[PDB]
Enzyme design. Structure first.
Site, PDB file in Angstrom:
ATOM      1  N   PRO B   1       8.808  51.328 -16.063  1.00 25.52           N
ATOM      2  CA  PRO B   1       8.541  52.481 -15.202  1.00 25.52           C
ATOM      3  C   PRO B   1       9.109  53.778 -15.768  1.00 25.52           C
ATOM      4  O   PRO B   1       9.983  53.762 -16.632  1.00 25.52           O
ATOM      5  CB  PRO B   1       9.237  52.109 -13.892  1.00 25.52           C
ATOM      6  CG  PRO B   1       9.286  50.624 -13.908  1.00 25.52           C
ATOM      7  CD  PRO B   1       9.504  50.255 -15.337  1.00 25.52           C
ATOM      8  N   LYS B  32      12.655  46.274 -11.250  1.00 24.20           N
ATOM      9  CA  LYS B  32      12.437  46.158 -12.680  1.00 24.20           C
ATOM     10  C   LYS B  32      13.764  46.149 -13.430  1.00 24.20           C
ATOM     11  O   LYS B  32      14.742  46.766 -12.989  1.00 24.20           O
ATOM     12  CB  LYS B  32      11.591  47.325 -13.179  1.00 24.20           C
ATOM     13  CG  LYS B  32      10.277  47.513 -12.445  1.00 24.20           C
ATOM     14  CD  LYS B  32       9.143  46.839 -13.180  1.00 24.20           C
ATOM     15  CE  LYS B  32       7.807  47.191 -12.566  1.00 24.20           C
ATOM     16  NZ  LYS B  32       6.713  46.435 -13.223  1.00 24.20           N
ATOM     17  N   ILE B  64       3.989  49.974 -13.313  1.00 27.13           N
ATOM     18  CA  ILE B  64       2.955  48.944 -13.264  1.00 27.13           C
ATOM     19  C   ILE B  64       3.271  48.061 -12.060  1.00 27.13           C
ATOM     20  O   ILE B  64       4.089  47.140 -12.142  1.00 27.13           O
ATOM     21  CB  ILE B  64       2.878  48.136 -14.561  1.00 27.13           C
ATOM     22  CG1 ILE B  64       2.531  49.058 -15.735  1.00 27.13           C
ATOM     23  CG2 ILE B  64       1.851  47.025 -14.428  1.00 27.13           C
ATOM     24  CD1 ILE B  64       2.717  48.421 -17.092  1.00 27.13           C
ATOM     25  N   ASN B  97       5.108  62.467  -6.942  1.00 22.73           N
ATOM     26  CA  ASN B  97       3.812  61.808  -7.073  1.00 22.73           C
ATOM     27  C   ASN B  97       4.009  60.402  -7.631  1.00 22.73           C
ATOM     28  O   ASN B  97       4.753  60.212  -8.597  1.00 22.73           O
ATOM     29  CB  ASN B  97       2.845  62.596  -7.960  1.00 22.73           C
ATOM     30  CG  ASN B  97       2.295  63.839  -7.275  1.00 22.73           C
ATOM     31  OD1 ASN B  97       2.011  63.824  -6.072  1.00 22.73           O
ATOM     32  ND2 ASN B  97       2.090  64.893  -8.043  1.00 22.73           N
TER      33      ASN B  97
END
Ligand SMILES: O=c1c(O)c(-c2cc(O)c(O)c(O)c2)oc2cc(O)cc(O)c12
Ligand SMILES: O=c1c(O)c(-c2cc(O)c(O)c(O)c2)oc2cc(O)cc(O)c12
Ligand SMILES: [Cl-]
Ligand SMILES: [Cl-]
Ligand SMILES: [Cl-]
Ligand SMILES: [Cl-]
Ligand SMILES: [Cl-]
Ligand SMILES: [Cl-]
Ligand SMILES: [Cl-]
Ligand SMILES: [Cl-]
Lengths: 114, 114, 114
Positions: B1, B32, B64, B97
């Site tokens: 990420p 993660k 992801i 975002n």
């Protein structure tokens, strides 16, 4: 098409001709007009990759088409190879986000490509 | 990420160890491994939020998976809380975002995660 | 909404009130309250457009809705006109990427817009 690379590598460590080399290699890789490739290198950034401030790079490639499983694998080998060769960034400290843009969502010259 | 924060807050106001705190808090929040977490802080930016140049932040989180309605709500409380505590940025002057990336569209280590 | 402009134009060549004019024109163009408009200008960048380092700009507009074929064409004419008039950037050296964000993927004030 547009390629952005953000890195903690200092500006003095970006070699002469880096923007030009990126422009040609991306034009050849994407098949898009070379005169239309936009490239943007942002050195000296405050960034970490896995908690370490060893040389790293975070990148994005936006293109109208020419994005996909196999093509992105080839782009990543190409781009990581360039960052390793010119900026001495290990490929396992590089992320490249790929964006397949709709022509209606890319503005240029007072309009869009749609 | 990958987490990026752009702010008009001066570099000196970013506390030492902020990149690590972001890395650890995001590894725990996303689940993660922190080795997978890239963080990028861009202070001293020319920005306005609602026309005002009070401390503000524009951020993005790419991952992801681990992106969704409830998770993004939880990320936003976590990330606004950190920017408020460490950078003194009011949460109502923060945008984040969120991007759920396809594995084929994330390059890393000369290939993609697909 | 959020508008970012990255350019190689020097900071001194960004006129007073540029952030404010962008906020007002984007509020009017998108129909969003200027109060929701965030703007970010990044001058002095190492960028090339078609291999040339003449003035150019790479931009993005993120908005929850108000994105589409006709609206983006209108946005591109509006924004290229502003960059040409205020920053002396030719419209044919400007890219603007448009993003219609889902409310669940925009964080603000410890939550999201979903
Ligand atoms: O950047 C450009 C681009 O991507 C292509 C293109 C657009 C599409 O919508 C496609 O489907 C496609 O295969 C190619 O057109 C262009 C034409 C120009 O004169 C200049 C450009 O810069 C592009
Ligand atoms: O950042 C990474 C990532 O997100 C995960 C991942 C990828 C997927 O495609 C998934 O579906 C998933 O659940 C996890 O794999 C990784 C494996 C690595 O060795 C290194 C990484 O950095 C990642
Ligand atoms: Cl493909
Ligand atoms: Cl798109
Ligand atoms: Cl990820
Ligand atoms: Cl994706
Ligand atoms: Cl919005
Ligand atoms: Cl004035
Ligand atoms: Cl429309
Ligand atoms: Cl979205």
């Amino acid at each position: 098409p547009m390629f952005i690379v953000n890195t903690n590598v200092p500006r003095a460590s970006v070699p002469d001709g880096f923007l030009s080399e990126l422009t040609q290699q991306l034009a050849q890789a994407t098949g898009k007009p070379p005169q239309y490739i936009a490239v943007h290198v942002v050195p000296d950034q405050l960034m970490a990759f896995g908690g370490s401030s060893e040389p790293c790079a975070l990148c994005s490639l936006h293109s109208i088409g020419k994005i996909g499983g196999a093509q992105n694998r080839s782009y990543s080998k190409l781009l990581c190879g360039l960052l390793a060769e010119r900026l001495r960034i290990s490929p396992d400290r590089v992320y490249i986000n790929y964006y397949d843009m709709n022509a209606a969502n890319v503005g240029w010259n007072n309009s869009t490509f749609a």
